[PDB]
Amino acid sequence: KNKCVNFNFNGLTGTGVLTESNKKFLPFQQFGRDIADTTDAVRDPQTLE
Amino acid sequence: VTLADAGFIKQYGDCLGDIAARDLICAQKFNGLTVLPPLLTDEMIAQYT
Numbered sequence: 001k002n003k004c005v006n007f008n009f010n011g012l013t014g015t016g017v018l019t020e021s022n023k024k025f026l027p028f029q030q031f032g033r034d035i036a037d038t039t040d041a042v043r044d045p046q047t048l049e
Numbered sequence: 050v051t052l053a054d055a056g057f058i059k060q061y062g063d064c065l066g067d068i069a070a071r072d073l074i075c076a077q078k079f080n081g082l083t084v085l086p087p088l089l090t091d092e093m094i095a096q097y098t
């Protein structure tokens with residue numbers, strides 16, 4: 001976290017910084033999408049944060 | 050007159066995390082669209098006026 005990386009979650013490849021969100025995802029949700037139809041949040045599958 | 054931006058210092062302290070979901074300006078910047086600042090300030094115009 002807080003470092004620049006080539007992430008992949010579940011096949012959602014990309015490049016970015018990752019950080020501990022405060023976004024109150026309801027328990028069924030896994031992604032947030034930005035206005036631009038581009039993912040901006042993900043719930044880690046091994047450790048649900 | 051109420052403005053979406055004027056080039057007024059975006060430093061990712063605001064634009065990364067919470068506000069990236071709502072501020073039009075953060076989304077533009079994160080997608081490679083930059084508002085540039087005017088050469089004269091709203092003080093410098095007030096001096097000429």
Ligand SMILES: *[C@@H]1O[C@H](CO)[C@@H](O)[C@H](O)[C@H]1NC(C)=O
Nearest residue numbers: 010043044045046047048049
């Ligand atoms: C991953 O494996 C460890 C044990 O090897 C376990 O603690 C953990 O629950 C596993 N991941 C998930 C999402 O259950």
